[PDB]
Amino acid sequence: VDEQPLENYLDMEYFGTIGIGTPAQDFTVVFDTGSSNLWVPSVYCSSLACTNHNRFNPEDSSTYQSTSETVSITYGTGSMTGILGYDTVQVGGISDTNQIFGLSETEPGSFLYYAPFDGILGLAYPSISSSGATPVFDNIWNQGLVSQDLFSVYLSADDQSGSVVIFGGIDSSYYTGSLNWVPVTVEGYWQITVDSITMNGEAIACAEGCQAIVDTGTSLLTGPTSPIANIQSDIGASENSDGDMVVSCSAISSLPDIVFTINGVQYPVPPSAYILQSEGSCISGFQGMNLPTESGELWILGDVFIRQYFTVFDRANNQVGLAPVA
């Protein structure tokens, strides 16, 4: 069974090291369940972010195959354009041969400049892959490189070592009790129904259900701007001088759990998880963002939620498994 250790950067970003090419050039990539493309910076890129991150040099790989096709990807934070190429990607002890990935041409803006990771390795469904490029886990499964068509994530808390993605297996060491299984509603993101969001037995948002994605590549709990403004009032958060939504640090001691009910099972998030300790003050772990789709406006169960719950992403049965971390 095949594990990829991930580095935890300030409880906000989780990334690991992959090898691309023969011999392997090393890159750090966010393992992102909210996107499906793999890309890294290349020598074709002259953007500011390309000058201070590792750059794939296709001339130096004996196994590189070029294409005449391009990729463009827009994220909630950051964007890129590139050209698609094929090479061997070494991920979690698996030699994923003939992998299509993007070599960046432009990475515009300051976000990717200041970020500690080089690229993104998307772990979601092929239907949201830009230029229809085969995702890494799809290519690993199609080549019979794993036996179980699933992967599982443990994200550590408090800047600690130990975060892992496990390709083709579960490790029951990481969770307590048994896995509860939730059907994926739409096969794109890892999208599920959240039955309701409650505090003190009252629905504060999503009273008659809402659609949420489980996203290792989103730092915070995200939802539509109007229900999120309601949640901010409920937890006593006010917009500070610099735009930040702050809450008194003393108040963690007296706030109740916010409960996500998913498939009739209660998933409490404590105030010590949903209020973050940042640069000396305490901030809300809830962020307002509108992502409208065919199936309404999405919530994101970001890293705040995943830290509390060991997550299994099952592609054989199109289900997500959740259990409390040990």
Partner: peptide
């Protein structure tokens, strides 16, 4: 922070 694809 990070919000990972539109």
């Amino acid at each position: 922070x990070v919000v990972x694809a539109x």
